């Protein structure tokens, strides 16, 4: 059975107290490996770690196409590592073969898109012709600087691509992080780090924490010498988690969890509507931060929509990760699974009509495993806890309308505001159903529509801030205005 | 200086600062180590209200005035606007349904093809089109010791300024970087390439870098540029690569060992010369190997996933005139019509597989050159056949299409048998024109098939295949048949 | 001459028996975006080509089944 | 014509149809639809079909004939 | 202007010769950062190259107001403030 | 901490203790003018005060005289006059 280690000061080490905790494969409740469970002490090992890599490092000074050079190194390492990683993925996060067989090459390409652009088009010096004071003649520009110890907090959905998504962001643009996967997937991080040694990364960059409990996460938000906060997980943690940093004054970036609105206009194809609305409700069973979980669809069209989305639903098939076969994976967890069954019981509780699903699934020649057969709520109430409270499971709530200005009133009727999609025939319709829509971003004839260089986040209380392209970039670094 | 600097960080304010000296340089370096978010130097509260203004540390956070200062105030939304309304449309969605094909995809075809015999002095014209004058020649020292690059820097006169003949087979990085500063110090402004697939594919790196600048790694992405590259003309030496057509350019990283891609509309060669003296004294191996891979080519482009009809008439035109024509050429060979023809064949095969994408054949072709320097060509043809039976049973009537192409008779047919005998046709032919058809002639040890078929597995040519690969199990039982 | 080969010009065939000129250049530069459901790929089209101004060109009969108007939907903003 | 080179236009003060050549009057994108020949009745699909089969066949017999068309007239003829 | 400086002399103790000028950069500020936005502000930026192939499509990003704000302000500078 | 119960976005702008440096080089008087103004400008209740004087050894002793008789040249009066 394979061992894991922390990643502290550019190289793998035991805990301090040697402790080690062991993690399970949720397809068959079998354990996977042993990882080295990190304290307090590890912790301070690592922020003074990454202070000393950014205070004395040579990381910070070197130019922005002397980094470029190293995080394509980084990004070749990390290629290389494409099936292991992929494989571990699925063993400890749920993932079908099929959807984490992209996430090396999809975090290699980030690192060099993120990395190029930083190099050739990103302003770290820009100019102010007129300052608007003619009482002080000089030359005023604005430099960009990096802001210092990064902290990134991810959580068990997509371990790999946040990862990625941290690093890249924290060490391209001239800062350290300290990473602190989630308990239940630590090896992928674990793993990056390995391709972030072999590609001579300077020690103390990137440091890697793995540790049950919160201790360990406290002690790295109270902590005097870390300069940022970037945290991704559930509202009620990340309101604690800022309430913990506001008493050090530091930036605090949050991505908290949507009920993203998917609605379907009365001239959209029915088709391409019902496909896309059950690969946006589905997709790694329900448990993506941006799942369109409420589907909004005009009365016009309800009843044929109804029957295609059924026969659609249950068309999905449900088995092991690794098998290349299936289309929907088990539960991160048994716990996942029993609040999943105790929505379901809410909603059926509320007068909710269940079209399908609703109980657990058996995967035939496999003894064990979160399985949850996907499931269709009907005849639901915008003001149902079920259409109000976020679940991270394979349920959607259907909520018919009869206008494009209800429908947007009901999306807008949340205190998520996250994602959310469209579907019509007409791009002028779309647009203007969109432009009111009071999300973070949104999908038109399409969903899930990842993209590089286009930033996302939350509106409302889905946190604040966003990541990818400039806009992302902006966040990792401070801003000084020089006057001569 | 330094403990004046110490002095001043040492503090869990960083709102602002100032510097008062004689000279700006010392004062900006004195300036650029304060940990404040504003700096005054021979001044003091110079307010502005373009001039960003805030605090670091315990000082708070965000910024005033300016566009950073009104950025504050608004919210960021992403909207896309997807290109298409109808299912399977997007390969993500492919994740979750039985049907993996997704033939939305957008054709075209920009080059500028020139062709015929004694069609080489086109190319002074073609230079006065493209509006450039400084033409620098790339190539090898095989292609450069048969004097067609002399006859190409005789044909551009006054608008050849230099020959690089330093291109090796199988080019890396460094060959990319050496060839770019070569043709930088000569000042050029357009790049002509007169040899095989690999001098073509360094070429359009070249012509990348001299655009953009900086180095060949950095380059190395999929659809990220913008605005049209150096123009390219190229001029093959080989009767098919197919690469003077297309957007796709391979190159070696000798750090990693693995070959990288740059994939690009915009590195398109703007024209060709298909000058039949540049094939005419091909020898018969390297004629037979690259018959083999424009077949290779064309068969595949008309069975992988994104297969589509306008691709599916090349692959199908370019098959008809290989099998017409390379017979002729094995048996009479300065034949210059059937050298044309088989050009033109080649041509069109990589019009078709620039769309419609290669399968498992190219994917276990590069790890065999990557790993055992094996030529593209011997790998595509003795893998062309094992992986069509390989696919037999997933591609539909393509292959009853392509054995129709070769003449072999499908009046009436299985789907399966039509697929078993177009792997037959190729067979004939393979053997009636003198091919190599086994791994075990060329060196490859049994034991290390297991590291090959690891190593197959980390291309980009999986997944267009029609026949979706498990893993490296299937990738073993492949590499064991060709043995 | 970008030619140097017997038949190349049309012209010198006035004193021959044989009339062929099979010496030409081929391009083909259109963009071409088929499929179902394609119309929207028009939006982005003209993001590419640069254009914010787009104007219909069309008949009595085509304008009648509301085949433009499906294309206005399309462009959106892009129309004017 | 959403891929040719030649425009014909009459002239009603001459009463022939005159003629512009160039390749830089070709479009730059074409959208082919079905949404916009689903509807088209039956004698304006069976003539156009015949418009095109007449270029596809024509091409392939003209003076200046290709390859490249050849593959091009044949497949559409195929197709047709 | 005057009434401006006046009372904010009278009330924070600013002198007349700094608190004149209050009305007057206030207004300047006020015009030049409309102009600005109305001008030079990217309220609609494009994205050309999003780094995924599998999505094509346009995209762009929407700037928009965030929505009630609550700005406090200290006994410093009141007016500029 | 109130504003984080309701996931809200804040801005803070806290006071500072703004490190004014002189180097050897320096021009003297100009130096000490912008000390002195820097220092107190409305008697030093602006948050971007520079209330920490650094000044280099070879230049402290002139520098400290005409600081001295610059502070002592101020006049502290009536806001209105």
Not at chain 1, 354 to 374: K, M
Request: aromatic share 8%.
């Amino acid at each position: 059975m394979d061992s894991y280690q922390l990643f502290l000061d550019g190289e793998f080490v035991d805990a301090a107290d040697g402790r080690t905790f062991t993690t399970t494969d949720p397809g068959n409740e079998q354990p996977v490996a042993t990882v080295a469970q990190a304290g307090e002490a590890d912790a301070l090992r690592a922020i003074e770690a990454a202070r000393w890599a950014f205070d004395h490092g040579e990381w910070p000074k070197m130019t922005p196409q002397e980094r470029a050079a190293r995080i394509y190194d980084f990004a070749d390492h990390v290629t290389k590592l494409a099936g292991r990683l992929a494989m571990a993925e699925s063993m400890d996060a749920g993932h079908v073969i099929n959807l984490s067989k992209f996430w090396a090459a999809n975090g290699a390409a980030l690192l060099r898109n993120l990395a190029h652009y930083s190099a050739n088009s990103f302003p770290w010096e820009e100019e102010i012709p007129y300052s608007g004071n003619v009482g002080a003649p000089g030359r005023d520009y604005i430099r960009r600087e990096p802001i210092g110890v990064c902290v990134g907090i991810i959580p068990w959905n997509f371990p790999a691509s946040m990862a990625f998504w941290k690093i890249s962001h924290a060490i391209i643009m001239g800062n350290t992080i300290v990473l602190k996967p989630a308990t239940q997937t630590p090896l992928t991080a674990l793993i990056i780090a390995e391709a972030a040694k072999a590609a001579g990364i300077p020690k103390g960059v990137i440091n890697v924490i793995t540790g049950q409990g919160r201790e360990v996460g406290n002690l790295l938000c109270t902590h005097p010498d870390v300069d940022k906060i970037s945290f991704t997980g559930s509202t009620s943690v990340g309101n604690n988690i800022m309430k913990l940093a506001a008493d050090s004054t530091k930036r605090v970036t949050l991505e908290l969890g949507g009920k993203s609105a998917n609605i379907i206009l009365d001239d959209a194809d029915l088709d391409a509507a019902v496909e896309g609305a059950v690969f946006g409700t589905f997709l790694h069973q329900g448990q993506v931060c941006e799942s369109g979980t409420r589907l909004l669809v005009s009365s016009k069209i309800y009843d044929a929509f109804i029957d295609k989305l059924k026969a659609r639903t249950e068309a999905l098939r449900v088995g092991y990760p690794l098998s290349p076969e299936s289309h929907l994976g088990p539960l991160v967890s048994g716990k996942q699974l029993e609040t999943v069954e105790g929505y379901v019981k809410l909603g059926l509780e509320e007068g909710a009509t269940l079209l399908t699903g609703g109980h657990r699934v058996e995967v035939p020649g496999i003894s064990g495993g979160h399985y949850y057969a996907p499931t269709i709520f009907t005849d639901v109430d915008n003001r149902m806890r079920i259409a109000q409270e976020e679940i991270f499971g394979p349920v959607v709530v259907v909520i018919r309308f009869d206008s494009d200005e209800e429908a947007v009133a009901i999306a807008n009727d949340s205190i998520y505001g996250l994602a959310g999609g469209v579907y019509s025939g007409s791009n002028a319709r779309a647009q203007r159903v969109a432009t009111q829509l009071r999300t973070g971003t949104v999908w038109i004839n399409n969903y899930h529509a990842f993209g590089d260089f286009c930033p996302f986040g939350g509106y409302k209380q889905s946190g604040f801030g966003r990541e990818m392209g400039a806009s992302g970039l902006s966040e990792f670094v401070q801003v000084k205005r020089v006057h001569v | 200086d330094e403990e004046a600097v110490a002095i001043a960080n040492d503090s869990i304010y960083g709102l602002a600062g100032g510097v008062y000296s004689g000279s700006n340089a010392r004062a900006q370096r004195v300036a650029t180590q304060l940990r404040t978010g504003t700096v005054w130097i021979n001044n003091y509260h110079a307010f502005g209200d373009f001039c960003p203004f805030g605090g670091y540390k315990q000082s708070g956070f965000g910024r005033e005035m300016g566009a950073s200062g009104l950025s504050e105030f608004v919210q960021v939304k992403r909207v896309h606007v997807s290109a298409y309304a109808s299912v399977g449309a997007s390969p993500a969605m492919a994740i979750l349904s039985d049907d993996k094909k997704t033939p939305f995809v957008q054709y075209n075809a920009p080059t500028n093809i020139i062709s015929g015999h004694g069609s080489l002095p086109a190319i002074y014209k073609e230079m006065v089109k493209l509006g450039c004058k400084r033409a620098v020649i790339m190539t090898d020292e095989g292609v450069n010791a048969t004097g067609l690059p002399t006859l190409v820097r005789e044909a551009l006169d006054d608008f050849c300024v230099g020959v690089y003949d330093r291109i090796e087979q199988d080019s890396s990085l460094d060959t990319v970087d050496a060839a770019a500063a070569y043709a930088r110090e000569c000042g050029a402004d357009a790049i002509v390439s007169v040899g095989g697939g690999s001098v073509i594919d360094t070429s359009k790196a070249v012509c990348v870098v001299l655009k953009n600048g900086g180095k060949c790694n950095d380059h190395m992405a999929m659809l990220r540029l913008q605005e049209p590259q150096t123009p390219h003309i190229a001029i093959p030496t080989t009767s098919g690569t197919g690469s003077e057509v297309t957007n796709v350019a391979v190159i070696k990283n000798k750090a990693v060992g693995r070959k990288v891609y740059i994939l690009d509309p915009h590195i398109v060669p703007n024209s060709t010369i298909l000058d039949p003296r540049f094939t005419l004294g091909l020898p018969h191996r390297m004629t037979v190997t690259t018959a083999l891979d424009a077949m290779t080519h064309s068969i595949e482009a008309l069975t992988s996933t994104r297969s589509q009809p306008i691709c599916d008439g090349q692959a199908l035109q370019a098959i008809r005139l290989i099998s017409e024509n390379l017979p002729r050429v094995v048996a009479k060979p300065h034949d210059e019509a059937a050298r044309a023809n088989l050009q033109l064949a080649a041509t069109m095969a990589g019009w078709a597989f620039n769309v419609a994408q290669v399968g498992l054949a190219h994917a276990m072709a590069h790890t065999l050159g990557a790993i055992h320097d094996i030529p593209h060509g011997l790998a595509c043809g003795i893998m062309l056949p094992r992986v069509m039976r390989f696919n037999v049973d997933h591609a539909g009537h393509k292959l009853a299409l392509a054995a129709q192409a070769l003449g072999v008779q499908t009046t009436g047919m299985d789907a399966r048998e039509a697929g078993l005998a177009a792997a037959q046709a190729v067979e004939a032919l393979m053997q009636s024109v003198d091919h190599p058809r086994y791994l075990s002639d060329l060196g490859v040890p049994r034991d290390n098939l297991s590291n090959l078929a690891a190593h197959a597995m980390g291309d980009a040519a999986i997944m267009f295949n029609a026949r979706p690969v498990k893993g490296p199990q299937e990738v073993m039982a492949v590499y064991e048949e060709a043995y």
